[PDB]
Amino acid sequence: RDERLSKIISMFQAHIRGYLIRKAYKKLQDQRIGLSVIQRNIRKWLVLRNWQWWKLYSKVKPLL
Amino acid sequence: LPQKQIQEMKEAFSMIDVDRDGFVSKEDIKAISEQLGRAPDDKELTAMLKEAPGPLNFTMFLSIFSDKLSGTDSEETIRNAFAMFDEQETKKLNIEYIKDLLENMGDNFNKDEMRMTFKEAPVEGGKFDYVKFTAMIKGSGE
Amino acid sequence: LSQDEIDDLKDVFELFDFWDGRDGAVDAFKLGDVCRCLGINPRNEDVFAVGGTHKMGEKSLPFEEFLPAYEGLMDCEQGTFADYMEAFKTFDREGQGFISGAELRHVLTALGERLSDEDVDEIIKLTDLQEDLEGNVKYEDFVKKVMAGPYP
Numbered sequence: 001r002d003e004r005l006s007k008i009i010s011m012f013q014a015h016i017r018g019y020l021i022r023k024a025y026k027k028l029q030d031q032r033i034g035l036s037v038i039q040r041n042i043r044k045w046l047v048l049r050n051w052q053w054w055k056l057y058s059k060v061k062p063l064l
Numbered sequence: 065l066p067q068k069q070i071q072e073m074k075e076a077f078s079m080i081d082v083d084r085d086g087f088v089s090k091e092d093i094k095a096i097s098e099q100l101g102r103a104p105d106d107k108e109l110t111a112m113l114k115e116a117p118g119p120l121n122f123t124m125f126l127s128i129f130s131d132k133l134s135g136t137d138s139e140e141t142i143r144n145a146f147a148m149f150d151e152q153e154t155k156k157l158n159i160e161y162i163k164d165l166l167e168n169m170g171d172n173f174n175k176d177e178m179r180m181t182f183k184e185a186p187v188e189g190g191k192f193d194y195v196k197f198t199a200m201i202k203g204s205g206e
Numbered sequence: 207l208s209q210d211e212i213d214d215l216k217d218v219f220e221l222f223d224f225w226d227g228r229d230g231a232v233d234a235f236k237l238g239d240v241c242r243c244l245g246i247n248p249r250n251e252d253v254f255a256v257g258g259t260h261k262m263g264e265k266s267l268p269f270e271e272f273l274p275a276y277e278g279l280m281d282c283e284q285g286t287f288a289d290y291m292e293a294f295k296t297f298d299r300e301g302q303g304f305i306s307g308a309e310l311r312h313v314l315t316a317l318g319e320r321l322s323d324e325d326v327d328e329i330i331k332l333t334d335l336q337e338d339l340e341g342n343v344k345y346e347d348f349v350k351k352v353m354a355g356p357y358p
């Protein structure tokens with residue numbers, strides 16, 4: 001009754017890999033939101049940093 | 065824009081408005097630029113003026129900034145997004161972890177967005193300061 | 207497969223696609239992981255059989271290639287409570303429903319498709335399995351908690 005005990009342990013181990021992934025799921029989703037927020041806002045900054053009006057405002061910012 | 069900010073642009077505007085007539089011309093921008101350092105080339109001056117639909121008084125000035133400066137997340141939103149990756153609330157991220165996130169995952173940064181982001185970034189002892197970086201990225205620092 | 211279940215795989219595929227860089231392909235090494243998010247519990251042996259790989263970097267799959275893969279895994283064989291208890295009955299030497307912490311961690315990391323020690327450490331944490339003063343656990347509770355999953 002071995003091969004069967006071994007097949008049964010593999011299917012229990014299978015349940016466990018399941019539990020762990022599905023646990024991990026909700027954190028991936030939340031973090032997808034976080035990494036998108038970070039990626040799209042850094043890029044707005046990069047765009048702003050090469051906009052001539054910004055470049056101009058940024059040099060007159062000190063003299064005021 | 066906030067009032068303090070709207071009020072800051074008024075003062076920026078009346079220094080850019082070199083001839084004080086109340087509009088900003090290609091000539092004003094050039095006079096004030098050449099005054100601050102290397103001026104942009106007149107092809108570039110032409111073009112930033114093409115950004116105002118009509119005459120460039122303060123109202124139209126305010127408005128081109130407000131359009132550019134909107135559609136971006138608050139500082140709290142951006143700081144919390146970073147904090148999702150900082151479970152101990154240490155308020156830093158290891159430098160290698162944040163590069164790996166940005167470059168390799170999501171909508172990947174290319175070498176030049178990577179080069180440019182971290183040219184500016186507050187990094188010390190292998191830790192990226194996302195609280196400070198967020199202020200920098202939103203102007204509550206830089 | 208049901209349209210709804212096809213929409214549901216759409217939303218998981220997309221989630222995983224972003225995490226190895228958003229380009230409409232998920233790595234074929236995450237093949238099993240996408241399927242588990244959908245509520246099935248295949249063996250690694252099962253997912254290798256429908257084209258799953260043994261390493262990141264090896265191969266990448268677009269949505270319509272995930273579809274038949276998920277379709278065939280859905281009839282993989284899943285273990286029952288009954289079988290689970292009988293298996294763990296074989297390690298129970300005193301017949302009172304216990305198995306020592308070390309024998310548990312030994313059967314999981316050593317037999318079948320062995321999990322890693324880290325995988326065992328984690329599952330024990332999440333199910334909140336605690337040993338008694340003698341170092342034993344009731345395996346019937348563990349078995350019930352693992353099968354009930356993280357949300358519960």
Ligand SMILES: [Ca+2]
Nearest residue numbers: 223226227231
């Ligand atoms: Ca991808």
Ligand SMILES: [Mg+2]
Nearest residue numbers: 083085087088
């Ligand atoms: Mg003027």
